[PDB]
From Swiss-Prot, chains A, B:
Identification of the protein by name: Major capsid protein
Species in which this protein is naturally found: Paramecium bursaria Chlorella virus 1
Additional detail: The viral capsid possesses up to five major capsid protein variants. They behave as asymmetric capsid components.
Induction / repression: Expressed in the late phase of the viral replicative cycle.
Subcellular location: Virion
SUPFAM superfamilies (UniProt xref): Group II dsDNA viruses VP
Main location: virion
InterPro entries per UniProt: Capsid_N, MCP_C, MCP_C_sf, VP_dsDNA_II
Keyword Glycoprotein recorded: yes
Gene3D superfamilies from the UniProt entry: Adenovirus Type 2 Hexon, domain 4, Major capsid protein Vp54
Keyword terms, alphabetized: Capsid protein, Glycoprotein, Late protein, Lipid-binding, Virion
A Pfam family hit: Capsid_N
Family: Belongs to the NCLDV major capsid protein family.
Residue positions the entry lists as glycosylated: 279, 301, 398, 405
From Swiss-Prot, chain C:
Notes on the domains: The hydrophobic region might anchor the protein in the underlying inner membrane.
Protein name per Swiss-Prot or TrEMBL: Minor capsid protein P11
Compartment(s): Virion
Main function: One of the minor capsid proteins that constitute a network internal to the major capsid proteins and outside the lipid membrane. The minor capsid proteins glue and stabilize the capsomers. the p11 zip protein binds together the neighboring symmetrons.
Oligomeric form and interacting partners: Interacts with the major capsid protein.
TM regions (residue ranges): none
Name of the coding gene: A352L
Induction notes from the record: Expressed in the late phase of the viral replicative cycle.
Amino acid sequence: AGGLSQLVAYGAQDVYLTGNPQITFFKTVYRRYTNFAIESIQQTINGSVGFGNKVSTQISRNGDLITDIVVEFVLTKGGNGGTTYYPAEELLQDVELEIGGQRIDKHYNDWFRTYDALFRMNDDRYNYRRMTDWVNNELVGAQKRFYVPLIFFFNQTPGLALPLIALQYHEVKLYFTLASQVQGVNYNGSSAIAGAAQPTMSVWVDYIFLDTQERTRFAQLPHEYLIEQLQFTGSETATPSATTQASQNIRLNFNHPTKYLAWNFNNPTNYGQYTALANIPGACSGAGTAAATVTTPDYGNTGTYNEQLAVLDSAKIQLNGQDRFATRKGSYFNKVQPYQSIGGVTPAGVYLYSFALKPAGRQPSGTCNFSRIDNATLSLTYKTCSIDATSPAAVLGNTETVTANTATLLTALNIYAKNYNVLRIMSGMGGLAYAN
Amino acid sequence: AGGLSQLVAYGAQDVYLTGNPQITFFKTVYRRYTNFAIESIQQTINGSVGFGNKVSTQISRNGDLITDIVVEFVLTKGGNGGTTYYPAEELLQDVELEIGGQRIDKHYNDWFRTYDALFRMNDDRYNYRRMTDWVNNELVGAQKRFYVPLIFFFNQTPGLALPLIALQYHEVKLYFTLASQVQGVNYNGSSAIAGAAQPTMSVWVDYIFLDTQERTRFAQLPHEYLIEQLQFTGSETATPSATTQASQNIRLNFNHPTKYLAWNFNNPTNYGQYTALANIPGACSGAGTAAATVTTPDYGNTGTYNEQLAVLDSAKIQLNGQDRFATRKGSYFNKVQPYQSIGGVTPAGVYLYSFALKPAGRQPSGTCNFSRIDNATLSLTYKTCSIDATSPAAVLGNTETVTANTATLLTALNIYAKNYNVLRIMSGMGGLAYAN
Amino acid sequence: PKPSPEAADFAQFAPKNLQAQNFLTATQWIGVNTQGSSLKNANYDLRADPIIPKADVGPWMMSSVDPNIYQKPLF
Amino acid sequence: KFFKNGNVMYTCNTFSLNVPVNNSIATIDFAEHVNGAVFKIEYNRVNFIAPSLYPISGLGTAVVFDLQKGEKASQRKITEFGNKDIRIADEISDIAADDHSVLITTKLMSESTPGELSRDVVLNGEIATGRINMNTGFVSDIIHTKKISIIDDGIVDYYVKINVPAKYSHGIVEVVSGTFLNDIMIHLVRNKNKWALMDSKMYIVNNTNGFVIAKNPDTAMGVSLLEWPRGAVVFPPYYNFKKFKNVNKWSISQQIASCVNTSVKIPGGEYSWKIRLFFGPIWQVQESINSV
Amino acid sequence: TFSLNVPVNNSIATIDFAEHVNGAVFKIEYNRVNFIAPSLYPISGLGTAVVFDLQKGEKASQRKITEFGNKDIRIADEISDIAADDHSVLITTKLMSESTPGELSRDVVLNGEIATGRINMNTGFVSDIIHTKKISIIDDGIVDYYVKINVPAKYSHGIVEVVSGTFLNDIMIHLVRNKNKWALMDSKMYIVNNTNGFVIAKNPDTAMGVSLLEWPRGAVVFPPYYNFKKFKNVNKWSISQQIASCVNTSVKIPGGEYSWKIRLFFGPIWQVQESINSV
C-alpha cells in the first residue's frame, strides 16, 4: 500500500531500466586505500620580503609527496572600506614553479584573479574573497592574515602530487615576485600611502607522508604525470573613442594542447578592473552622489556583472587563418561559455572559449593542439566608447554596440592558454617531455 | 574551417590524450538497477511533546531499508523579524540513534549547526535555513512548518540505507530531547515570552521498497557497513580580557579512525553564537544606532564572517606529546582547512582540521585513529579581549591578537570528532565491529 | 521446545518474510575493545618498543598494562 | 604505475569474411554460490587443496602430486618469429611465488564443484628479457574460468577458459607439475591397437592419435580429453593443433597458427577446453577407461 | 502478403563464408578431388581423378509450378543450360580459399520470356532469387557441398541438386535406415529412395558415396505439414524436397532462408560402405 503499489507496477517500458540488474543503490562498498598522513610545515624564504621584492622558497624533503601550498601575508589597511580589492593576490604578483632547474609555468597577478573569476564559481569564491580581501567593512589600521592558495596543477587534487621522494637529486623551488603597488595598502590609485608597513610572508606546504610499501615504489619506479601548464604573453588593446569602431587581430603565440583560451581587458593601474567605470552603484568611487568620479573605481566593487560596461563587442578564434566558429558577441564568451562548460558565473569583462568538455576538471576532454597550428589568431571587435559615464541614464539605457567613454583606459590585453604536458620522473630527476 | 581544423592538426604529444582511445564522451552506457520505490511514511511518537520534554519513536518495518528520516515541527513566533536563529535546531536538542539497545550515534543541536556551518554550504544552506528558521522578516504570531533532516550514517547517501529486513530481532529507534528554551519562541534573551504554545512534531521516515530477489538476499545474507559516528563531550574556556595571551591545553577523549576534528567557542545562552557581540551591522541588537545593545545579539544575524570577533588566536594538535603539525593562527582553521577539504564558506567562529583528503565525502581518505595513541591534546592560544565592543573605530580597526571585550562570553568549548566504525548485521541482529 | 501460542508453523509458503537466527549476540554486539590496557603505559617515543613478555614473575607486582606494541612500526 | 592493482584496455578489431569459425563446443555455466578465499573439496578420499595463493595447488588420496605447483592455464598470444617465453599470460603470479598478484572477480562453489573467474597476468612483468618490448600493465585484459565438477562415479571434469579479441599464436591449456614419482607413463592410441607403454626415451609427445593418458607408480591418475574447439563448422584446412607434451612433468597445449598465418584473422570469441580426470589404483583407472 | 498462417519449417542448415575475393575463373583441387568452374557455368567437373560428364554439371533449381505435377513451365534455374555456352547469369560474388570455393549466384528463368505448353509466369529472364554454394574439400577425401534457396511467401517445390552422372554406373546400392544391411537392388535402374532410404552409393567399380546431412524440417512440434524428400536415381541424379506439391491455399511457407547440406565423397565401394558403417 503505497511504495508497494508502485513497486509491483512493473511492465515492458521499465525492462531496459531494471531488467537483469547490474548495480544497486542500497549497499555501497568502499575501496581500501594506501595509508598516509597529511603534514603541513613552513618552508624557508630566501631573500628580503617586501613590496616589489623577489624571494625564493626552497621546498624541503620532509615528506614524500607535495600537495596543497598556501602563501600567507600579514598586512594592515591604508584606507576605509571599499578601498581594497583582493590585495593579497595583487601582492602575490607572480609565482613561478621550477623543478630541477627548469620551469613548469608562471602564474601572474591577474591570472589568480581570472581563475577565481571563471572557475571557482559557487559560494567558495566568497570564502576565497574572505581569504584574500577585506570583507567586513574594515577600517584604517585593521590587521589581517591573508591566505592565497596556489593553483598549480597539483594544488587542488592529490592525484598529481609532486613525488619528491623520487626527485632526490633535483629540487623544487617556488619563485615569488611581490607587487610594488597594492591598492589600498601602499597606494590609493597612484597616490602613495604614508606609513605602510612591510608584510610578513610565510609559505606553508602540505606534505604527504605515506606507507613504506608504496613509498618505496614511488622512490624507485618511473612516473608520468598529467602535468598541466599555464602559458602567457601580454598584449595591448585597440579600444576606440567615438563614432569609430575598432577591431584588431592578435597573434596567439601558444603551443601544446589546450583546454581553453581565457582573456580579459585590464586597466593597468587598477588591479582587477575588467570593465568601464560608470556613475552607477558599484561602478565607480562615490557613484550615485555628487562626488562621483568615473575615473577612479570603487575598488571593493571593482568586479561587477553588468556587461554593458564591457568593452568587447564580438570575437572569433582562427586556426591557420580559418575561422573556428563564426563571430560571437562578447556576451557569448562572458555568459554562455562558462555556463556550457563549468556551470558558474563569469564577471563582466572576463571571457572564455573552451575546447574541453570539462575544462574545470583534469580528465582530458577535448583539446586544440596549438603545436600543430602554424598561425592562430584572436580577432576582437570593440564597442564604440561613446556613452557619457557620468550620466546614470546614459549607461543604464543605451544599446548593445556601445560602451562607456571610460573604457578607453582598458589598455592592457591579457590572453591566457591552459595546456597539457607530461612530467616524467626518472631516477632522481624530473622534467617536461615536450617543449614547443 | 571549423572542427576539422583541429582533427587534422593531430600531433605527437596527443598520444597521451587521444592516441589509442580507451573511452569516449559521446556514448554513455547506463547500468541497470534493482526495482524499488520510495515512500514517506509517518511514524508514531511516544512521549508528551513540549519544551524540555523527551520523546522517542520506535520505527516500524513499513519497508526494507530506511533511506531518510526528517523530523518536523510546527512553531509560532514569540517575536518579530530577527529574533530567531535556527530555532528548529535549538529545539531538536539531542538525537540519539539506537539499533538493538546499544547506542550507535548521538547528535547535538550545536553539531547540527556545526555541520551546517561546515559541509552544507551552497544554495543548500539557504534552503536548509528555510526549513529550520524564519527567513522572510516574519512578525509575532507567524506559523510555519519546520523540517530538520537528520544526518546519521544512513541518511546522507542511499548506499548506507539501514536494512530493517536484515535486522528483524533488534529495535531501531530514535530518542529526541526538546530544548526547554528556544530563542525567539519561548524566550527573548533570557526572559520568558507569555503565550508560547507547545510545539507539534512528527517524525517522517522514508522507506525503500525493493523487489523480491534482492529483498531475499538482504534478509538472508550478513552485512558489513562502513558507518560514521560523532564523538562529543563539551568543555569550557578562560579567555582573558587583560594581562595575558592565555593558553589552554585540553585533553581530548576520542577513539576510532577520525576523519576530522571540528570545534567552536559558543555562548551557552545564545544558541549558535560563535563570535563576539559588537556595535557593528548584524553583530548586536540595534547595532549602528544609539539604541544598540552589545550584550544581546541581533539573533537573525548571529552568524557572521568577521574573524576579528573570534577568541581563537592559534591552535595546534599534539599527539603523544609531539606536534603533528606546527602552530597555525585561528583564521587558518576557519578558512584554509575547509577550503582544501570541503570547498565552501565556513562562518566565523567555526573551526575544522582534517585528517582526510575529502572529509565531506563518504569514502575513507586518511584518518587519525585515536584508539592507538596515548595523548590527544588540542592546544589553544586566545585573543586578548581588550577593545571596546561598542566603538566601530576599535572593532573594525585593530590588530590580529585582540578582540572585543564582549568576546569572553564565548565560554563553551565544543570539540567534535567524526570517525569511522563498522556496523555488523548478522542473523537479524546487529552491533559495532569495534568499540571503545 | 516451544509453547503453542508462539506461532503458526511455517509451511507451504515462501514469501521470505522472516529470518533464521541463534537469538544471542555478545562481543560482536558491543564491539571489540582495541585499546585493552595498552594505553596505561606508553610509547610516546615513536620507535616501536621491543617487547619483554608479561611473564608475571613476581607474585605481588604483576600489573595488567598489556604488551602495547605498535601494530606496524615506522621502520 | 605499471604495477598498479589493475587497469583497463580497449582493443579495436574488425574483419569481414576472412575469419573461419572455430566451434567452441564446450562451454561453462554456474549455479553455485560465492565463497571467500579457500576451498577444501573431497570425494572418495580424493582431496583438492585450493589455497589463496592460487586456486589449484594440491590433491590426492593421502598423497600429493607435487610440493610446489598446481595446474594453471596460460597463453602465448604473440610469438612473432618463434621467440622465447616473452608473453606468458599466466593465471598464477609465479614470479612472486608468495603473493597472488592476480585479480579475482568471482569465486562460486558448492561442495564437490568449485568454479572460478579470474584475470591473468603477464609473467615477466615489464622486463624486456627478449629483444622486443613486452607489455604495459602487469594485469592483462584476458579472463579465465574454471569448473571442477566431481561426479558421483569418482571422476572429475575439469573445464578451463580463455578469451581474447584476436590471436594467431600458441595457447597453453594446462601447465602441470606431476611429481617425478610416476614411473609408468602409458597411453592408448585411438586405433585401440594397444596401450603404447614407452619409457626408454622419457621424451613423450602424444599427438592427435593419442586417445587417453595415464601415469602411475602402480597407483594411477587417468586423463581423458573430451572437448576442444575445432573449425568443425565447415571443416576447412584451417589449423587446429591439439596435442600433449609429457617431456616436462606434464603440459597440455593448443595452437592456432605457426606464429603467423598467410592472410587470416581470428574470431576473437570464447575458447574452451573440457578434460576428464580421475583417480585410483592402476587397476581401477585402466578398468574404467577401457570401457571406452 | 500473409500474417501468421505459416508453420515453422526450420532451416537448420545455413551457409556462410570465410574466403577471399577472386576474379572470374576457378579451379579447386586437393588430394585428387577437384572441381572445375569454367565460368561457362559454375560447376562442370567433379570427382577423384575421374570425370562424370563433359557438358553438364551440378546445379540447384526450383519448380515454382505446383499445378498438380505440371510440366517444366515455371522452372527457375541456376544455369542458362539451354544455351549451354553463354553464361547469361549474374553472379554476386566469387570467393575462394585453399580447397574451398564459395559463390552467390542470381538465378534465371529456364524457359525465358516466351510461354511454353499453355501458360507461363515471367517478368524477365533474370530473377531476384539468390542461390548459395559452398564446396569444402576435406583432406580425408570427403567434400561437403551446400546449396541454398530463398523465395519469399512461397508454396513450392525445390530441387536440391541436379547433376548428370556417367553411363558407367551399372551397380546401384542403397542402405535402408534400419541399418540391417545394404540393399543391392539394381534390376530397375531407377530407384526412388524416400524417407526410409538412409545413404546411397553408385559404382561401375569405384564408388561415389552420398550421405545427407541437413534438410529443413518442422521439428518444433513435428506437425503433419508436408515435408517430403526423395531421390531420383537414374543416369541423371536429382535430389529434391517437396513442401507444397499441389496448389495449397490453406497453409503457406514462411519464405525465409532454406539450405541443404549433402556429404559427398569417393573411393572403392568397400571403403564407401565402411566409412558410413563406421558412423
